[PDB]
């Protein structure tokens, strides 16, 4: 493809250059070409992939919500039209990632399998944010199943302070509140996740405790805004 004549190592190098330059579209593109070499990604490579696509899709969601809110207060076809144009681009990026996950990445180490399944649920969540009708809750089921399988693996194979486990549960909680119309389970899981991290705070790791304490603060922040 676009990047198939480039060495995988150079693609990783340039993904990092693009991150320094805040060229997240380029970053995602280099990382996609790297994934497509057919070898698995290290922890650091996994995170370059997630960062790139999160920035790209994050800016698309921010634009969609602007226009969508304008489109609500307005109720000429121009706002619908343009909202729909951004919506269709957002859907294309989600499909790209979801295809990368099912075609190459998901397949491994437990932290690895949780990571990708949490991404599958996340980008199914972003599609759900803009979908409607029969297509919609087909998406919601897809998101839930990806999240559920990831929760089971992380409870079994990861300590309760692990930042992927914590971050997974923060996002599954948000899925419950904002997507599945169940503030109850959202609050329960957020509080269970925090309480259990504190019960076994001795499991924090030299390499990752800063990350865990941050996600734990975010779990409290979501409970504070939901109470």
């Amino acid at each position: 493809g676009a990047m198939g004549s480039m060495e995988r190592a150079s693609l990783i190098q340039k993904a990092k250059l693009a991150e320094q330059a805040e060229r997240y579209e380029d970053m995602a593109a280099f990382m996609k070409g790297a994934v497509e070499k057919g070898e698995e990604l290290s922890c650091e490579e996994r995170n370059l992939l997630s960062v790139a696509y999160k920035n790209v899709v994050g800016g698309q969601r921010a634009a969609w919500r602007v226009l969508s809110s304008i489109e609500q207060k307005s109720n000429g076809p121009e706002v619908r039209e343009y909202r729909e144009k951004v919506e269709t681009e957002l859907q294309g990026v989600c499909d790209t990632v979801l295809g990368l996950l099912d075609s190459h990445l998901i397949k491994g180490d437990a932290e690895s399998r949780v990571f990708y399944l949490k991404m599958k649920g996340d980008y199914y969540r972003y599609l759900a944010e803009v979908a409607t009708g029969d297509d919609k809750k087909r998406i919601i089921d897809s998101a839930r199943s990806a999240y559920q399988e990831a929760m089971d693996i992380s409870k079994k194979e990861m300590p309760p302070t692990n930042p992927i486990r914590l971050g997974l549960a923060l996002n599954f909680s948000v899925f419950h509140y904002e997507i599945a119309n169940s503030p109850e389970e959202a609050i329960s899981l957020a509080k269970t996740t925090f309480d259990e991290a504190m019960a076994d705070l001795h499991t924090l790791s030299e390499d990752s405790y800063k990350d865990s304490t941050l996600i734990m603060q975010l779990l409290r922040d979501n409970l504070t805004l939901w109470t």
């Binding site: 996340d122 971050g167 923060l170 996002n171 948000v174 509140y177 904002e178 996600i215 975010l218 922040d221 979501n222 805004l225 939901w226």
Partner: peptide
């Protein structure tokens, strides 16, 4: 919006 990571 609530926080995600």
């Amino acid at each position: 919006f609530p926080a995600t990571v």
